[PDB]
A paper describes a structure:
The basic units of IMPDH are tetramers that dimerize to form octamers upon nucleotide binding. In contrast to the eukaryotic enzymes, bacterial IMPDHs only contains two canonical allosteric binding sites in their Bateman domains.
We then set cocrystallization experiments to obtain high‐resolution structures of (p)ppGpp‐IMPDH complexes and were able to solve the structure of the IMPDH from S. coelicolor bound to ATP and ppGpp at 2.0 Å resolution. All monomers in the AU showed well‐defined electron density in the Bateman domain that could be unequivocally attributed to ATP, ppGpp, and two magnesium atoms. Surprisingly, ppGpp was bound to a previously unrecognized pocket within the Bateman domain adopting an elongated T shape conformation. 42 The (p)ppGpp binding site is different from either the second canonical (GDP2) or the third eukaryotic noncanonical site, although its δ‐ and ε‐phosphates partially occupy the canonical Site 2. The ppGpp binding pocket in StcIMPDH is mostly formed by the polar side chains of residues E118, R125, and N144, that form hydrogen bonds with different atoms of the guanine ring. The α‐ and β‐phosphates tightly interact with the basic sidechain of residues, R71, R125, K206, and K210, whereas δ‐ and ε‐phosphates, which point toward the γ‐phosphate of ATP1, coordinate two Magnesium atoms, together with the carboxylic acid of residue E188. No electron density was found in the canonical Site 2 or the noncanonical Site 3.
Author numbering:
A (entry chain B): 7 to 389, 434 to 480
B (entry chain E), C (entry chain N): 7 to 389, 434 to 478
D (entry chain L): 7 to 388, 434 to 478
The structure:
Amino acid sequence: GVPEKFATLGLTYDDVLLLPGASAVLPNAVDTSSRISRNVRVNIPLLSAAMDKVTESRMAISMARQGGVGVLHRNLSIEDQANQVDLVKRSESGMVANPITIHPDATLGEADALCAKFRISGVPVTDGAGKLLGIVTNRDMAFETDRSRQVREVMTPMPLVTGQVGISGVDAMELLRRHKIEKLPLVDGDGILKGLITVKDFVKAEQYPHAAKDAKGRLLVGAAVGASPEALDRAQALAEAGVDFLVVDTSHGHNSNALSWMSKIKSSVGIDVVGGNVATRDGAQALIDAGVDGIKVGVGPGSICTTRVVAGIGVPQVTAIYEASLAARAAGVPLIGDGGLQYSGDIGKALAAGADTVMLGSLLAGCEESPGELQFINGKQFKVPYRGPLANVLHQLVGGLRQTMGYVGAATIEEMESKGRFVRITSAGL
Amino acid sequence: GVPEKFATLGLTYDDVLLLPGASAVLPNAVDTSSRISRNVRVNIPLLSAAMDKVTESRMAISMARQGGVGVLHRNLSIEDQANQVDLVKRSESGMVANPITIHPDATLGEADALCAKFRISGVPVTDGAGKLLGIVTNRDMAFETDRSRQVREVMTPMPLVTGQVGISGVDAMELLRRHKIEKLPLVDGDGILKGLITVKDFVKAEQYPHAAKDAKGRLLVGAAVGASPEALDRAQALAEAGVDFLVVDTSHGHNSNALSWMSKIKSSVGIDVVGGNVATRDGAQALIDAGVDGIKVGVGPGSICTTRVVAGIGVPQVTAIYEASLAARAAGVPLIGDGGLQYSGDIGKALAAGADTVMLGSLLAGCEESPGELQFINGKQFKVPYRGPLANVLHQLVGGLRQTMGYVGAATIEEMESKGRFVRITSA
Amino acid sequence: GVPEKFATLGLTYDDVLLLPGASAVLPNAVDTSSRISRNVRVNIPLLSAAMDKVTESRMAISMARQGGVGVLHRNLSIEDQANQVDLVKRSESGMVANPITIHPDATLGEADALCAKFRISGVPVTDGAGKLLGIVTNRDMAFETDRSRQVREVMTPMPLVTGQVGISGVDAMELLRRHKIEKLPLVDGDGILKGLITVKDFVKAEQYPHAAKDAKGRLLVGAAVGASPEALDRAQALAEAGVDFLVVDTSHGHNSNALSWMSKIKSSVGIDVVGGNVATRDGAQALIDAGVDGIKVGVGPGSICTTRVVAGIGVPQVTAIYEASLAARAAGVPLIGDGGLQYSGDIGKALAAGADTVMLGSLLAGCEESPGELQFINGKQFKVPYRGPLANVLHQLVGGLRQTMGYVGAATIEEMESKGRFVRITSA
Amino acid sequence: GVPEKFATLGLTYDDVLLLPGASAVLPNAVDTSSRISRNVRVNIPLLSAAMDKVTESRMAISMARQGGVGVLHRNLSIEDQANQVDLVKRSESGMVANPITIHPDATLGEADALCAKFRISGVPVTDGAGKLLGIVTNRDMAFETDRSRQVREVMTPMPLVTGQVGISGVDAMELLRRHKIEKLPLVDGDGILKGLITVKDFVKAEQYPHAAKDAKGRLLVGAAVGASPEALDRAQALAEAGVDFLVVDTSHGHNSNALSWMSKIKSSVGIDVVGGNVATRDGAQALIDAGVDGIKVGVGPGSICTTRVVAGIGVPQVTAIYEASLAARAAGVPLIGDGGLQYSGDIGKALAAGADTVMLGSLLAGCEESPGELQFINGKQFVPYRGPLANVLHQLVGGLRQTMGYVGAATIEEMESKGRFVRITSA
Ligand SMILES: Nc1nc2c(ncn2[C@@H]2O[C@H](COP(=O)(O)OP(=O)(O)O)[C@@H](OP(=O)(O)OP(=O)(O)O)[C@H]2O)c(=O)[nH]1
Ligand SMILES: Nc1nc2c(ncn2[C@@H]2O[C@H](COP(=O)(O)OP(=O)(O)O)[C@@H](OP(=O)(O)OP(=O)(O)O)[C@H]2O)c(=O)[nH]1
Ligand SMILES: Nc1nc2c(ncn2[C@@H]2O[C@H](COP(=O)(O)OP(=O)(O)O)[C@@H](OP(=O)(O)OP(=O)(O)O)[C@H]2O)c(=O)[nH]1
Ligand SMILES: Nc1nc2c(ncn2[C@@H]2O[C@H](COP(=O)(O)OP(=O)(O)O)[C@@H](OP(=O)(O)OP(=O)(O)O)[C@H]2O)c(=O)[nH]1
Ligand SMILES: Nc1ncnc2c1ncn2[C@@H]1O[C@H](COP(=O)(O)OP(=O)(O)OP(=O)(O)O)[C@@H](O)[C@H]1O
Ligand SMILES: Nc1ncnc2c1ncn2[C@@H]1O[C@H](COP(=O)(O)OP(=O)(O)OP(=O)(O)O)[C@@H](O)[C@H]1O
Ligand SMILES: Nc1ncnc2c1ncn2[C@@H]1O[C@H](COP(=O)(O)OP(=O)(O)OP(=O)(O)O)[C@@H](O)[C@H]1O
Ligand SMILES: Nc1ncnc2c1ncn2[C@@H]1O[C@H](COP(=O)(O)OP(=O)(O)OP(=O)(O)O)[C@@H](O)[C@H]1O
Ligand SMILES: [Mg+2]
Ligand SMILES: [Mg+2]
Ligand SMILES: [Mg+2]
Ligand SMILES: [Mg+2]
Ligand SMILES: [Mg+2]
Ligand SMILES: [Mg+2]
Ligand SMILES: [Mg+2]
């Protein structure tokens, strides 16, 4: 009973429910892996948002360890954001081919700061030519009080227990078990340091068996850039640091200038580039025509959010995802749902509506791994209420998603769009 | 104005109303009987849910006395659940062919514990062959202080006033009246005890004239089982104890393994087997194809309930009942509405939408007959706010249904689906 | 304008404030040490209460490390409470003269369980005569997958780096630094194991420089007992495990039977015994006459708490402390304030009113170190809202007390009673 | 019915009321002048607190124009605080002997920045020796777009209408009127600039006839310093910039080290030094013995405030003022009531209890003249926006005049004797 100008009805997550369907698969047996972009895969379909209150290196590391991925925020210098990337890539199994080093004339303070930075308990000591001279570890410094003392005075000097480039995990773990050590430098025939294996690599692989990793076995990570000449310089620095994909993050992804920078940034790097944000079919198509490898969907998804109140602009998120998916699914381009979430059950709704993954934002701002210092004022806060470890949040969200997939009969994420049947509900049902 | 992926609108009870229609029948004259399953009938269209806070024997007994039926929960051992079944079946008129007995060397404590267990005021005393030796009753023990004293010392010994196998109610009552006694053992020609009638059988028949009973005149009762190998052992034990139907209770009735166990639980017993839960036409058809004698409908029926919040899964209950009824009515399989209730008027809505009965849940957890212990903390609670006797809840619910039926013109539940006309309403 | 029967006005913490006074001492320079009892001293004047939701070994260890002390609750078996004591006493520097050991035939699973129990990363391996055979540590077991494997197969055998009984801290650390090891077994001339030093002893001494310790350098701990024959057996078992003081915990410390058991318990052990609870001068004097080494003050201290509502019994806590201190100060017996706290500033008020230390209760139940299990239900809770590490609670409380002492001019706790001047305030 | 240790009852403003008394004086006729310290006088008995959200130069100027005084906060460098002092002292009539100047080689941007800084509409242009070359004013720059143009190109050059040092207000005004100009440079016989009069001096004197001023006719101002070697240097820098009194501002005024610095600072300057904070008779006496010229009273005056909750320390403010005044009134040392205010009626209560003036704090943080930036977020904010200070002070002073009329006090000094108190219950 409305004119055509107003015919379309937009739906939010609360407006719809998924129906139970014929199922031969239990929640604990479904596969939750999905694609961030054409060439980036995760083991749970969740990202942490590129917000300065949410994702720096510690959050990105935990997300990837749990099988998702973090998108490092860009509200910091190029050098600081690239450093955040490096910390993620060189977290565990990341020093097999790019180890940290220290010169023997350095102080213990410099060595300990490096150990704290990369969260590891030792540094190979090398000369200017990269020849291995020895190794200084936490135990060598445990009883040292003078931080000005030189590394050479406390390090364990060569000859050390070492391995060859390409040593297998089983063989490297047999040199840490036989010699009662936790570190294994990798050297070439001339004794030049080529890599480093430590017990951390094996401990973290066992504790986090579903970690999302790159082809080199290092934790996956993404990073946000803007749409500007500066964003191009930032993109290059992040690619050099080893980032696995870029997110060109704009409030209006359908702006022609933003689209142009997406194309320019994409053509200037060899890694996947995600573009956003859009909330319509034609906007998603414009991003695809601009060449992005994934799209991010969400413009004014939240009730009485800023763009809605200030500008009257917005799209209910189920409709936004569905409309964008008409273009994205037709092109085979993964779709990230970004905004409007209110329950773990909304994840399955997003996937059945056409999303491949879902980005989590303010929900992860109170988590231990988010940036900011934990402060105490009668209760615990992040300087936002303290929520505890990320792992507890993700376990509940992924547990919920597995329930949805079992109820719908989807053994894989790719089956969700076809097997998920929707019903709309009224405000009485809500 | 939505894409077809989202065309369907689901309706809950609050979304609709029933219209008044042409009527020639008053509320006090309508018939409220309905079917639980193909071969199980009740006198009011209501069940108590298989929740451990709701239905054990006391709840099941009261439900059946009021004309409904209870579904005994399964959060207990097979032997404990079978015992709950036995307590219901042998409540009133249930010992005519399976009496309790005690040996003459038993203590008064053992006899009184048996009386308390079955809520009967005496025990026939027999020897190892079943020969009736006497009877010990509440009055025989009233003034006794030593609980170790042997039954034989206080029992009334044979010869007793007894009845024959097959004695009628009228004849049994006349014997009780004439001899001013409350118990009538039933014996065969050799004096072997075959059954027992007590005044409770007549008192409860008069107090509860609409009791739901089996073909032998014993209170009806159901019991829940899971979907697993253990559920098959449980089913056999419950059937042996005299349960009238089984409810294969699963959260996702459309799961292939759950459906398979339904066909394995149904084919292994001779009593009716209900399956659930489903909320779609295709789900109901899958239950029917698996061979169940009734279906239970309800998946995420409640606003912001657990499956909805955790998993985003759910179906508004009016739509769920209607869609499932499209399959159930064509197959002649009764449909139990399980969940989403908020008012007594919702019962009539469920029936007009296609349900045959409605299962009551947390509503009843506060009733006197629920398993919890009544405790006092400034006010009364169950250890859940105390609601009082089940009878008060059912009286209001059944009274409401009779009003609906009078307004719609339905003289029977079976007329509700055709005569009940709906209108949707807005939030205003 | 009231009868003499009602002349006395009782004051709670909120009724009074402390005045600023002449001061030559800054908050960061005051001394916060005080006495729990005649012969037990702490570095901050705070105890954790003997409640089963608050203080087991983990809470007691953290309290002592921060300079206070925990009182282990008694809602568990005698052997379990004594085990809790043992865990505290042998936390750090507690195995120098009483080490844990394991047979060479024991499994890695058994060795790891012992390491987890005492929060130590290795076990000396000995024979039945206590002769040292080797040592098995976390690194020896790090890559092992079979938990049934023998410890002798993965352990480092003698000869080990060892020290003499009585080795100094500097000398032991020198051995750990030169041999790049974390353990130093202590042996006699015949190679019998006499003690164990590990890097934990040095790490924890550096991290917690204000730890409250006994004469042997082990963390202080108290434990609660009741007032009954069983409490006498419990007291002995706790004393044997190395507890530093006992708290006879009753709600009516002025009961003649409770007073009698305090004397009996006091006379049956050699360690300090605290008695409570009381809230009057005559009650404190009765505890003192019974022979206790400290008193605990608090009977119905909180507005609309249970004893007040149920029984109308209670004493505002400032009055309770002051009245009890009239007896306790004359006898030189320390006074523990137990209850009624609402602000960190109430600590200074209690001390100025006559308390020597203050017991903290439900405040701490939400701390990480409390016995409950940390669970996540949208937010973090203990099974009570999760508050985080004890250290921040104590840091805020001790910081506030230091502010109080600076304002009043008290350089030491005992100066609080004389230099702390009070003013009463109205509800405005 | 309590032990002697707890005998004393402390009273706050809400605990008491003043009685009406015999009165022959109406509210509009009472005199509201009082003393900040032995040698500093105000026309309304109110100060603005030395909080960085309350009093910088703009707040201090408005307070002084209304007859009170501001105490400039010290959460800034010595040179930044001294600059704040200079801005107040050289607000109106403050350049008669210390004018701003600019060189002919300066730009219009630099000239306009100076005019904006001192809120003056022109700058005398001088050479390096101070010889007057001309004057550049707002009207000279009104139509100038280039902000890099040199002042010499747009200034009015000498010969200007000038006056001599010591010219009277009446004579200076006649020159401004006769020549239809707003500026009057003051020069010596050699044409060296010695001072400056502008129309602002007369406009502001007429708009603010009760402006609290010093002996030279410049707006009064105070400034806070700490209790430390750095505060001794800060005190000298503030006294060189022309501050009229210092406030040695500590959370614990009865601390021996704080008292020692009060004595050291007092003896190192020639201006009045106020010390605080205290809340007892012995604390006030210790401040007096240290040599201060006024005391500030208030330690944990507010219900469930920080010092009360964290440390259990505090004194209800009526008791604090009364007890401190027992020492203050005996020595003739003025007493500043600092904290606990909740109504305009509490001012009269403070004065009747023994205070000479009352310091206003967070109340004023929302006023236009407070340091914060006025921002619009659906509504106006700085805390909520309160508008001009004048509106707050008008209501507060109006209330005090009502109190004095009801009590019969023609002067502030009569409040202590004529103000009769009654305590009230929570009912
Ligand atoms: N010097 C120094 N070392 C740090 C610091 N933080 C962590 N480490 C060390 O790096 C390794 C990894 O620490 P984790 O805390 O578990 O790493 P994670 O953040 O990536 O999860 C550990 O050594 P490990 O040898 O791999 O394991 P383990 O021997 O401690 O068991 C740890 O001792 C620090 O701030 N300074
Ligand atoms: N020894 C013993 N008897 C119990 C106990 N509980 C109930 N009874 C008796 O069993 C019969 C049923 O009691 P009800 O209370 O009416 O049974 P109900 O729970 O099934 O409704 C009564 O005897 P009746 O002869 O059938 O009726 P009446 O003579 O009491 O009127 C009653 O006295 C018990 O705990 N111990
Ligand atoms: N096998 C085993 N060891 C445990 C366990 N819990 C703690 N530990 C070990 O005991 C020592 C104390 O751990 P903490 O966590 O600091 O002790 P705490 O509870 O008393 O504070 C550490 O070894 P350390 O050598 O003293 O310190 P470090 O080598 O880790 O630096 C730690 O590795 C456990 O559950 N199982
Ligand atoms: N160039 C410039 N001038 C400013 C600025 N702010 C104030 N003025 C001028 O200085 C004099 C004081 O302005 P006020 O607003 O009254 O000063 P106030 O802050 O102390 O109250 C006025 O000139 P007047 O000649 O004394 O008065 P009138 O001719 O404006 O009436 C005014 O035009 C500024 O930011 N830049
Ligand atoms: N590959 C190696 N060859 C020789 N010595 C080594 C080697 N790796 C480590 N060390 C030395 O062995 C000793 C133990 O160091 P390791 O790396 O095994 O543990 P750590 O991380 O310092 O110990 P902890 O886990 O107790 O903090 C140190 O002196 C270290 O320098
Ligand atoms: N069939 C019977 N023949 C003979 N005596 C009987 C018979 N049934 C019961 N009695 C005896 O009659 C007396 C009354 O018992 P009855 O069963 O009538 O009532 P009750 O339930 O014990 O009493 P109450 O209802 O007062 O609690 C008892 O001594 C009982 O032993
Ligand atoms: N006193 C000792 N003499 C000889 N070997 C020792 C001695 N103490 C420990 N070891 C051996 O040294 C190796 C290192 O053990 P240590 O006690 O130093 O700690 P760890 O178990 O390696 O701890 P971490 O978890 O910190 O790596 C182990 O093989 C242990 O058996
Ligand atoms: N003492 C003076 N002698 C000569 N000319 C002067 C003198 N003072 C100002 N002028 C010049 O007179 C003109 C008017 O300036 P004046 O100071 O009177 O007002 P203004 O503050 O610049 O203007 P307005 O009040 O309109 O903003 C300007 O050219 C100014 O240079
Ligand atoms: Mg290590
Ligand atoms: Mg270690
Ligand atoms: Mg009877
Ligand atoms: Mg160790
Ligand atoms: Mg280690
Ligand atoms: Mg002008
Ligand atoms: Mg003008």
